Design a protein around this motif. Structure first.
Motif, PDB file in Angstrom:
ATOM      1  N   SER B   1       0.809  -1.035  -0.030  1.00 12.87           N
ATOM      2  CA  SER B   1      -0.057  -0.066   0.151  1.00 12.87           C
ATOM      3  C   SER B   1       1.015   1.169  -0.015  1.00 12.87           C
ATOM      4  O   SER B   1       2.178   0.924   0.017  1.00 12.87           O
ATOM      5  CB  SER B   1      -0.882   0.108   1.415  1.00 12.87           C
ATOM      6  OG  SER B   1      -0.150   0.548   2.375  1.00 12.87           O
ATOM      7  N   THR B   2      -0.027   2.375   0.033  1.00 11.11           N
ATOM      8  CA  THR B   2       0.921   3.723  -0.183  1.00 11.11           C
ATOM      9  C   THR B   2       1.607   3.977   1.165  1.00 11.11           C
ATOM     10  O   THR B   2       2.643   4.636   1.241  1.00 11.11           O
ATOM     11  CB  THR B   2      -0.175   4.914  -0.434  1.00 11.11           C
ATOM     12  OG1 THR B   2      -0.311   4.756  -1.668  1.00 11.11           O
ATOM     13  CG2 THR B   2       0.603   6.069   0.280  1.00 11.11           C
ATOM     14  N   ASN B 185       1.847   0.148  -5.713  1.00 14.53           N
ATOM     15  CA  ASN B 185       2.128   1.596  -5.416  1.00 14.53           C
ATOM     16  C   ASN B 185       3.512   2.107  -5.740  1.00 14.53           C
ATOM     17  O   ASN B 185       4.204   2.574  -4.857  1.00 14.53           O
ATOM     18  CB  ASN B 185       1.833   1.749  -3.896  1.00 14.53           C
ATOM     19  CG  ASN B 185       0.492   1.494  -3.653  1.00 14.53           C
ATOM     20  OD1 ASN B 185      -0.096   0.399  -3.356  1.00 14.53           O
ATOM     21  ND2 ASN B 185      -0.605   2.282  -3.757  1.00 14.53           N
TER      22      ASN B 185
HETATM   23 CL    CL Z   1      -3.009   2.786  -0.945  1.00 13.87          CL
END
Ligand code: CL
Lengths: 216, 214
Positions: B1-2, B185
């Motif tokens: 994820s980010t 990402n």
């Molecule tokens: Cl994200």
């Protein structure tokens, strides 16, 4: 409709690569199939390679890989002068659907001049549609090309369409489609260069396709 | 994820400063460790000072300022340029975790295009997360920044990300992270300049680090 003709183009568009038999392969840009076993290819895809004699061409037709020796293809220039885009016959590639009658006729050219168009292409395999401003035409236009990293030579294009738009490396070989339904959204030519914020393509007409149906 | 990729960036971010061997250090922006003793540095951080003779480059890594003389740094390019962002080896600095494989691959750039991204940076130690508009790409982008003090300079960038967002002085050197979950990402580049509501970052790909590990 732009999307109708875009789908025809998509079906005939293949990834073009160059290399040595049993060796390394560099995927470079796109090539467009036009009829039977004939395709349109921008010359800078192979012009600056170090050794044409032992050059092998590679094609990716929807996940199936075909290859042919450069000494076994038939090449045909569109016009006289600097080699910019050529017609290449590949016997070992599957038969292409005839879309020759979808390109613009030599006489219909002014009816496409001044209007918008769409570049139907792929970047490393991913389909893209790029919008180009009002098209102008130039009798002979120059651009700059870089050999795989480093050096930069100046190349010209004969009878070129000029659109304003932002590129993306690898777009070369795509087909330009006019937005004018009056001329049945004709295919105007092939993408060869992108630079400052100008996209340049070579005009390809219905008349450049006569010599391909002649026997030998 | 980010958040995960953002975390990897924070641990490798350091401050860059200029000064003499026995005086005070002028801190100017951030630098990003990519692997071992290599760092990504915006070239405007040092290219406008003309007395390389007594010049020291400083790096704050964990409260300790490591230095190297201008006459001792190995500087390397990404494509062929040097006007925008350079790789810099500083042997004295503690080793950085390798984050190179988190950068975007060239053939995947079209999937980062037209999507949001997050800028992970710091301003005097202070961590910041900034959302950047649907990203657009440009062949060359020109930005004239007041970056120095009261001096204005031309900063031109090759293959740049352009996006809507707000800035601050000193954010330079931070990294751009893609919101696209299907390309894990990916880190897309390094923030070079920003001003009114536009932020400019240089595109950096995985392939670009071929120059260093050999
Ligand atoms: Cl994200």
């Amino acid at each position: 409709s732009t999307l109708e003709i875009a789908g025809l183009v998509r079906k005939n568009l293949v990834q073009f690569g160059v290399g040595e038999k049993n060796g390394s392969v560099r995927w470079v840009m796109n090539a467009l199939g036009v009829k039977d076993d004939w395709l349109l290819v921008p010359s800078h895809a192979y012009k600056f390679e170090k050794d044409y004699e032992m050059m092998e061409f590679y094609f990716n037709r929807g996940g199936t890989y075909y290859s042919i020796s450069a000494g076994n293809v038939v090449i045909q220039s569109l016009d006289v002068g600097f080699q910019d885009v050529v017609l290449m016959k590949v016997p070992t590639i599957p038969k292409f659907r005839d879309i020759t009658q979808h390109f613009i006729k030599k006489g219909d050219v002014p009816r496409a001049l001044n209007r918008l168009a769409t570049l139907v292409t792929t970047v490393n395999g991913t389909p893209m549609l790029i919008s180009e401003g009002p098209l102008k035409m130039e009798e002979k236009a120059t651009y700059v090309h870089k050999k795989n990293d480093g050096t930069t030579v100046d190349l010209t294009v004969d009878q070129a369409w000029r659109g304003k738009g932002e590129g993306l490396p690898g777009m070369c070989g795509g087909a330009l489609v006019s937005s004018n339904q009056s001329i049945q959204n004709a295919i105007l030519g092939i993408h060869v260069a992108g630079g400052n914020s100008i996209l340049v393509a070579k005009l390809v007409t219905q008349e450049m396709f006569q010599n391909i149906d002649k026997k030998i």
